[PDB]
Design an enzyme around this catalytic site. Structure first.
Site, PDB file in Angstrom:
ATOM      1  N   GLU A   1       0.769  -1.269   0.086  1.00  0.00           N
ATOM      2  CA  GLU A   1       0.127   0.004  -0.121  1.00  0.00           C
ATOM      3  C   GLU A   1       0.816   1.215  -0.025  1.00  0.00           C
ATOM      4  O   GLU A   1       0.712   2.030  -0.885  1.00  0.00           O
ATOM      5  CB  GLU A   1      -1.028   0.055   1.285  1.00  0.00           C
ATOM      6  CG  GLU A   1      -2.016  -0.961   1.195  1.00  0.00           C
ATOM      7  CD  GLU A   1      -3.126  -0.854   0.064  1.00  0.00           C
ATOM      8  OE1 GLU A   1      -3.016   0.446  -0.701  1.00  0.00           O
ATOM      9  OE2 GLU A   1      -3.980  -1.780  -0.250  1.00  0.00           O
TER      10      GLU A   1
ATOM     11  N   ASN B   1      -7.562   9.028  -6.069  1.00  0.00           N
ATOM     12  CA  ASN B   1      -8.125   8.002  -6.705  1.00  0.00           C
ATOM     13  C   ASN B   1      -8.984   8.831  -7.880  1.00  0.00           C
ATOM     14  O   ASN B   1      -9.230   9.954  -7.772  1.00  0.00           O
ATOM     15  CB  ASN B   1      -9.188   7.267  -5.789  1.00  0.00           C
ATOM     16  CG  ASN B   1      -8.420   6.601  -4.599  1.00  0.00           C
ATOM     17  OD1 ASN B   1      -8.998   6.768  -3.497  1.00  0.00           O
ATOM     18  ND2 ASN B   1      -7.543   5.717  -4.907  1.00  0.00           N
TER      19      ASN B   1
ATOM     20  N   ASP C   1     -12.284   8.789  -8.613  1.00  0.00           N
ATOM     21  CA  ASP C   1     -13.545   9.624  -8.135  1.00  0.00           C
ATOM     22  C   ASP C   1     -13.219  10.547  -7.425  1.00  0.00           C
ATOM     23  O   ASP C   1     -13.930  11.217  -6.740  1.00  0.00           O
ATOM     24  CB  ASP C   1     -14.299   8.469  -7.483  1.00  0.00           C
ATOM     25  CG  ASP C   1     -13.964   7.861  -6.351  1.00  0.00           C
ATOM     26  OD1 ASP C   1     -13.287   8.393  -5.636  1.00  0.00           O
ATOM     27  OD2 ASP C   1     -14.436   6.621  -6.265  1.00  0.00           O
TER      28      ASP C   1
ATOM     29  N   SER D   1     -11.544  10.957  -4.326  1.00  0.00           N
ATOM     30  CA  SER D   1     -11.085  10.498  -3.016  1.00  0.00           C
ATOM     31  C   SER D   1      -9.440  10.311  -3.226  1.00  0.00           C
ATOM     32  O   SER D   1      -8.836  10.301  -3.925  1.00  0.00           O
ATOM     33  CB  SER D   1     -11.660   9.304  -2.582  1.00  0.00           C
ATOM     34  OG  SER D   1     -11.443   8.240  -3.220  1.00  0.00           O
TER      35      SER D   1
ATOM     36  N   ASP E   1      -6.269   8.212  -0.756  1.00  0.00           N
ATOM     37  CA  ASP E   1      -5.949   7.173   0.220  1.00  0.00           C
ATOM     38  C   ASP E   1      -4.655   8.065   0.962  1.00  0.00           C
ATOM     39  O   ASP E   1      -3.723   8.445   0.512  1.00  0.00           O
ATOM     40  CB  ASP E   1      -5.459   5.917  -0.526  1.00  0.00           C
ATOM     41  CG  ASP E   1      -6.437   5.492  -1.193  1.00  0.00           C
ATOM     42  OD1 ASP E   1      -7.709   5.633  -0.948  1.00  0.00           O
ATOM     43  OD2 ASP E   1      -6.007   4.513  -2.014  1.00  0.00           O
TER      44      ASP E   1
ATOM     45  N   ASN F   1      -8.665   5.478   2.892  1.00  0.00           N
ATOM     46  CA  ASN F   1      -9.755   6.241   1.926  1.00  0.00           C
ATOM     47  C   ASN F   1     -10.483   7.426   2.461  1.00  0.00           C
ATOM     48  O   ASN F   1     -11.318   6.904   3.294  1.00  0.00           O
ATOM     49  CB  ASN F   1     -10.183   5.397   0.993  1.00  0.00           C
ATOM     50  CG  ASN F   1     -10.665   6.033  -0.231  1.00  0.00           C
ATOM     51  OD1 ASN F   1     -12.042   6.610  -0.173  1.00  0.00           O
ATOM     52  ND2 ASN F   1     -10.218   6.230  -1.429  1.00  0.00           N
TER      53      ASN F   1
END
Ligand SMILES: [Cl-]
Ligand SMILES: [Cl-]
Ligand SMILES: [Cl-]
Ligand SMILES: [Cl-]
Ligand code: NA
Length: 129
Positions: free
Chosen positions: A35, A46, A48, A50, A52, A59
Site C-alpha cells: 500500500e 483516486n 473518483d 477521494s 488514500d 480512503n
C-alpha cells in the site's frame, strides 16, 4: 517516516493488530508494504476524487475527513492528515474499524491482490516480537 519492516511489525503488534479479526501480523505488514512501501507520508488520489492516506492507504470516501471529497463520510472521526503521522496510532485504530466492516482485509486492494493466500509469516521472520 519510512518504517523498517520489523520496526513496523513491532508498532502494529503493540497497537493490537496481530490476529485482529483473525488476521495474523504478517498480513498487516505485507499490506503496508504494498500500500505505502512503509512510508507514513504516502498519498494517492483516486479517479473518483477521494484520496488514500498513510501507511495503510485509508480512503477519504468513508474513513477520514480531507475537506475535498464531496458527499464522503468520516467514520474514523479524524482528519486524513492524522493518518500521515510518524505515530501510527490513528492509522491502526481506523484500520480496526475498516477490517470489521464485513469484507475483512479485502478492503485493501493490494492485500487482496498481492498478500492474500501467500506466506505472510515471511513478513515478520527475523523480527523480535
Ligand atoms: Cl527494522
Ligand atoms: Cl503472520
Ligand atoms: Cl470532504
Ligand atoms: Cl475475515
Ligand atoms: Na471523508
Amino acid at each position: 517516516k519510512v518504517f523498517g519492516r520489523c520496526e513496523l511489525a513491532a508498532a502494529m503488534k503493540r497497537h493490537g493488530l496481530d490476529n485482529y479479526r483473525g488476521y495474523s501480523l504478517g498480513n498487516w505488514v505485507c499490506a503496508a508494504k504494498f500500500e505505502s512501501n512503509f512510508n507514513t507520508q504516502a498519498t494517492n488520489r483516486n479517479t473518483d476524487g477521494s484520496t488514500d492516506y498513510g501507511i495503510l492507504q485509508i480512503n477519504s470516501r468513508w474513513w477520514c475527513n480531507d475537506g475535498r471529497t464531496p458527499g464522503s463520510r468520516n467514520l474514523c472521526n479524524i482528519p486524513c492528515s492524522a493518518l500521515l503521522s510518524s505515530d501510527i496510532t490513528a492509522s491502526v485504530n481506523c484500520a480496526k474499524k475498516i477490517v470489521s466492516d464485513g469484507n475483512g482485509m479485502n478492503a485493501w486492494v493490494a492485500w487482496r491482490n498481492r498478500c492474500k493466500g501467500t506466506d505472510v509469516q515471511a513478513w515478520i521472520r527475523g523480527c523480535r516480537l
